[PDB]
Amino acid sequence: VIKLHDLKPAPGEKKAKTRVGRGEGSKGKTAGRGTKGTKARKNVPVMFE
RNA sequence: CAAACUCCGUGAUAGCUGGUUCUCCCCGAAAUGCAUUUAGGUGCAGCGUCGCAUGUUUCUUGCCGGAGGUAGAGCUACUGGA
Numbered sequence: 001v002i003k004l005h006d007l008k009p010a011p012g013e014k015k016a017k018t019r020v021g022r023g024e025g026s027k028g029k030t031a032g033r034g035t036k037g038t039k040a041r042k043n044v045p046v047m048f049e
Numbered sequence: 050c051a052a053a054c055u056c057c058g059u060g061a062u063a064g065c066u067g068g069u070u071c072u073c074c075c076c077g078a079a080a081u082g083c084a085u086u087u088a089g090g091u092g093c094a095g096c097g098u099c100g101c102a103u104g105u106u107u108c109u110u111g112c113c114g115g116a117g118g119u120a121g122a123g124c125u126a127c128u129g130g131a
């Protein structure tokens with residue numbers, strides 16, 4: 001018997017989103033951008049070497 | 050006031066400064082080279098990580114084959130110098 005409550009997503013379909021910057025517990029204070037730098041502020045184009 | 054004030058383009062633009070919030074488990078860097086209107090930025094390769102693949106090809110020692118050209122030494126051997 002299938003009720004609307006027993007539905008199960010398949011193992012591995014649901015990968016949790018990565019909420020960058022939410023405490024030193026997981027991703028803290030720099031959001032995986034390292035310390036100061038251009039990538040630390042906005043970005044650099046796809047082109048300029 | 051070395052270009053008045055209010056509104057608007059306007060979230061002007063900031064390679065600069067600050068800040069970036071709940072827990073645990075696993076691995077774990079560099080401050081190097083090259084290039085750069087580049088030197089406090091950035092990209093490539095090394096350095097980490099995760100996955101896949103080759104599953105030891107890697108490591109240590111012993112022995113073997115090797116080329117050096119340093120320490121030292123030498124100079125009636127040269128270049129110098131006494």
Ligand SMILES: [Mg+2]
Pocket residue numbers: 035036
């Ligand atoms: Mg900071």
Ligand SMILES: [Mg+2]
Pocket residue numbers: 035036
């Ligand atoms: Mg720095």
Ligand SMILES: [Mg+2]
Pocket residue numbers: 034035036037039
């Ligand atoms: Mg950086």
Ligand SMILES: [Mg+2]
Pocket residue numbers: 054
């Ligand atoms: Mg006025």
Ligand SMILES: [Mg+2]
Pocket residue numbers: 057
């Ligand atoms: Mg407007």
Ligand SMILES: [Mg+2]
Pocket residue numbers: 058
């Ligand atoms: Mg505009």
Ligand SMILES: [Mg+2]
Pocket residue numbers: 060
């Ligand atoms: Mg602004």
Ligand SMILES: [Mg+2]
Pocket residue numbers: 042063
């Ligand atoms: Mg900007």
Ligand SMILES: [Mg+2]
Pocket residue numbers: 066067
């Ligand atoms: Mg500061």
Ligand SMILES: [Mg+2]
Pocket residue numbers: none
């Ligand atoms: Mg460790």
Ligand SMILES: [Mg+2]
Pocket residue numbers: 105
């Ligand atoms: Mg083997």
Ligand SMILES: [Mg+2]
Pocket residue numbers: none
């Ligand atoms: Mg030998």
Ligand SMILES: [Mg+2]
Pocket residue numbers: none
């Ligand atoms: Mg020999």
Ligand SMILES: [Mg+2]
Pocket residue numbers: none
């Ligand atoms: Mg000597």
Ligand SMILES: [Mg+2]
Pocket residue numbers: 123
């Ligand atoms: Mg002698």
Ligand SMILES: [Mg+2]
Pocket residue numbers: 127
């Ligand atoms: Mg001579």
